[PDB]
Amino acid sequence: MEKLRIKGMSYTMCSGKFSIDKEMAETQHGTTVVKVKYEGAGAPCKVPIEIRDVNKEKVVGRIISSTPLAENTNSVTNIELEPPFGDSYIVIGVGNSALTLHWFRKGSSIGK
Fold this sequence. Notes:
Genome polyprotein; 0% helix; Immunoglobulin-like
């Protein structure tokens, strides 16, 4: 019930910090693939992921690897993700905890 549950639906969780645990690499599907780790609190997560515009005010991306999750701090998750055709800022965690990392779509390593 706690953790044995429908994980990607039945949670709204981790305000804690995360690691960027592999850099972004783009696909033939035109998506990009992050890999995350949790840090915060040991326990499982669904993980807050957005992509925000250059000013970082407006959400501009769509996550493709379903609703992002991490089974523990010691766990990692590869995440297929769909940014706009330009520069943008993936955010992983909530504000103060958010891994706020650069990307540029089709210029597929000008941000990482």
